[PDB]
C-alpha cells in the first residue's frame, strides 16, 4: 500500500515534483534496509548475497522497481532532495546487478513508452555540478580574512557529490552484468 501510494503520487500530473517529507523519510528506510552493512569464507560471502537478494526481493516484488522510475520521470530534470533519495533506493535494490530488478525496470519502460524518464535523466546530468575555481577562490579569501567559517565544509565547489555519484552508479547498476538489452536501450 505504501509503495502504491508513492507510485500514484508520482503518476499524478503536476507542474513540479513537490517536496514530501513522507517520501524522503520512507525512501531512506526502504533503501537502508536492503544493505544492512577479515576475509569472509565462501559460505559467509554466499550468505551475504542470498540475504541481499531476499532484502531486495522484499521491495521489487511490491512494485518498488517501477516507483524509482516514476519518481525520476516526474522530476523533469530538476535536482533536489527528492531525486537524491530516489536514486539511493534504485541503487539499494540494484546492488549486485540484480537481474530480476533489471528486467522489471526495462519491461516497465518498454511497456509505458515513457519518454519523460530519459528526458529527466538528460536534465539531471546536465544540471550536475563540477569543480568551480571562482567559488574556491572566494572561499579561500574568506578563510584568509580570518572570518569564522560558519558554513560546514564549503560545499559550493562540487555542490552535490553524492547525488552526482549515485546518478551514475544507478546507470552503471542498470547495465551491470553485461545487460545487452538495456545497454542498447540507453
Amino acid at each position: 500500500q505504501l509503495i502504491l501510494l508513492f507510485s500514484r503520487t508520482a503518476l499524478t500530473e503536476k507542474c513540479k515534483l513537490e517536496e514530501d517529507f513522507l517520501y524522503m523519510a520512507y525512501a531512506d528506510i526502504m533503501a537502508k534496509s536492503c544493505h544492512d552493512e577479515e576475509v569472509k569464507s565462501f559460505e559467509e560471502k554466499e550468505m551475504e548475497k542470498q540475504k541481499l537478494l531476499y532484502q531486495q526481493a522484499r521491495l521489487h516484488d511490491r512494485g518498488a522497481a517501477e516507483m524509482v522510475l516514476q519518481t525520476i520521470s516526474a522530476s523533469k530534470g530538476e535536482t533536489g532532495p527528492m531525486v537524491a533519495a530516489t536514486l539511493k533506493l534504485g541503487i539499494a535494490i540494484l546492488n549486485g546487478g540484480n537481474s530480476t530488478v533489471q528486467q522489471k525496470m526495462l519491461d516497465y519502460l518498454k511497456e509505458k513508452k515513457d519518454v519523460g524518464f530519459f528526458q529527466s535523466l538528460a536534465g539531471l546530468m546536465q544540471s550536475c555540478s563540477v569543480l568551480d575555481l571562482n567559488a574556491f577562490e572566494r572561499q579561500n579569501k574568506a578563510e584568509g580574512l580570518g572570518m569564522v567559517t560558519e558554513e560546514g565544509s564549503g560545499e559550493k565547489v562540487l555542490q552535490d557529490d553524492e547525488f552526482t555519484c549515485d546518478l551514475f552508479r544507478f546507470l552503471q547498476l542498470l547495465c551491470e552484468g553485461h545487460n545487452s538489452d538495456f545497454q542498447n536501450y540507453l
Binding site: 500500500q1 505504501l2 501510494l5 500514484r8 503520487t9 517529507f21 513522507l22 523519510a25 520512507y26 571562482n134 577562490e137 572566494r138 579569501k141 574568506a142 580574512l145 572570518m147 560558519e150
Partner: protein
C-alpha cells in the same frame, strides 16, 4: 504483550489497520504512515523541535506574550486576501513588533519564529497579486521593507538569513523604484541591506545575481519610465530615476568596509 506506551500502541494500531483492509483514501494512508514514522523515529522529533526552542527570563514573559500575539496577528493574515482592513492590521503588527524590547534583546528567537519569512511571503503575495498593474497597496510594501531592513541591522546572523532570499528580492526589484519618498522602503533596498558592510555576504554574491541588476539598468538606459511619461513628464530615451536606484545596490556589492571587493 502489554503496550503500556503511546508509542507502542500507535506502532501497532497503524499496521493492524493497514493489514486488515486496503485503504481507499490516499489521505488516510498518508496520515497512517506519517504517525508510524514518528513512533519509529523518536529522536527525529527532538532534532526538529529543539531548534525551535528558546528560553527567556521571568521578567520578559509578559513582553514576549505581547510580541507573540502581534506575530500571530501577522501570521493569520497569510490566509486572507490583502485589503484595506488588512492595511492597518499589518502596519500595527509591524509597529508593535519593532516597538518591543524583546525584538532587539533576542534576535535568535525572532529568527527561530520565522518572522522574516512571514513578512516576506506577505509581501510576496502583495507583489504577485498586483505588481504588473502597478503596486496596489503601496503603504504595505513600504512597511514590509522598512521592517525587513531593521531586521538585517539587528545582527549579522539575521542579515545572513535574509541574504538567502536575495534571488526573489532581485526578481521583484522594479516594484517602487521610481515613486519618490519610497527610499529604504523598497524591495531592492532590502536586497542592498543584506550585503551592506558584510564582507562574507558580499563575497557570497554570484555572477548570475549580478547579471540581472545590470540587465535592469540596461533597460533603464534604453527605455523611458512609462509611469513617469503617463504622469506628463517629458519623454527622454532613458530612465534616470530608476537607473540611479540600480547603481546604489551595486555600490553596496563592490564596496565593503571602506575597501573594494576585487572579486
Amino acid at each position: 504483550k502489554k503496550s503500556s506506551t503511546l508509542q507502542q500502541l500507535i506502532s501497532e494500531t497503524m499496521v493492524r489497520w493497514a493489514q486488515e483492509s486496503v485503504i481507499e483514501d490516499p489521505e488516510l494512508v498518508r496520515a497512517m504512515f506519517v504517525l508510524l514514522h514518528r513512533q519509529y523515529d523518536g529522536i527525529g522529533g527532538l532534532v526538529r523541535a529543539l531548534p525551535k526552542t528558546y528560553t527567556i527570563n521571568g521578567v520578559s514573559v509578559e513582553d514576549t506574550i505581547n510580541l507573540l500575539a502581534s506575530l500571530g496577528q501577522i501570521r493569520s493574515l497569510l490566509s486572507v486576501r490583502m485589503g484595506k482592513e488588512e492595511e492597518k492590521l499589518m502596519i500595527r503588527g509591524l509597529g508593535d513588533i519593532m516597538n518591543n524590547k524583546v525584538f532587539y534583546q533576542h534576535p535568535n528567537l525572532m529568527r527561530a519564529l520565522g518572522m522574516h519569512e512571514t513578512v516576506m511571503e506577505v509581501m510576496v503575495n502583495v507583489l504577485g497579486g498586483g505588481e504588473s498593474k502597478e503596486i496596489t497597496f503601496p503603504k504595505m510594501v513600504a512597511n514590509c521593507c522598512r521592517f525587513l531592513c531593521y531586521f538585517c541591522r539587528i545582527s549579522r546572523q539575521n542579515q545572513k538569513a535574509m541574504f538567502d532570499h536575495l534571488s526573489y528580492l532581485l526578481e521583484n526589484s522594479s516594484v517602487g523604484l521610481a515613486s519618490p519618498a519610497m527610499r529604504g522602503s523598497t524591495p531592492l533596498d532590502v536586497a542592498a541591506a543584506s550585503v551592506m558592510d558584510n564582507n562574507e555576504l558580499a563575497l557570497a554574491l554570484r555572477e548570475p545575481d549580478l547579471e540581472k541588476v545590470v540587465r535592469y539598468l540596461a533597460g533603464c538606459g534604453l527605455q523611458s519610465c512609462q509611469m513617469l511619461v503617463s504622469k506628463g513628464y517629458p519623454d527622454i530615451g532613458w530612465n534616470p530615476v530608476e537607473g540611479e536606484r540600480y547603481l546604489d545596490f551595486l555600490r553596496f556589492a563592490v564596496f565593503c568596509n571602506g575597501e573594494s571587493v576585487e572579486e
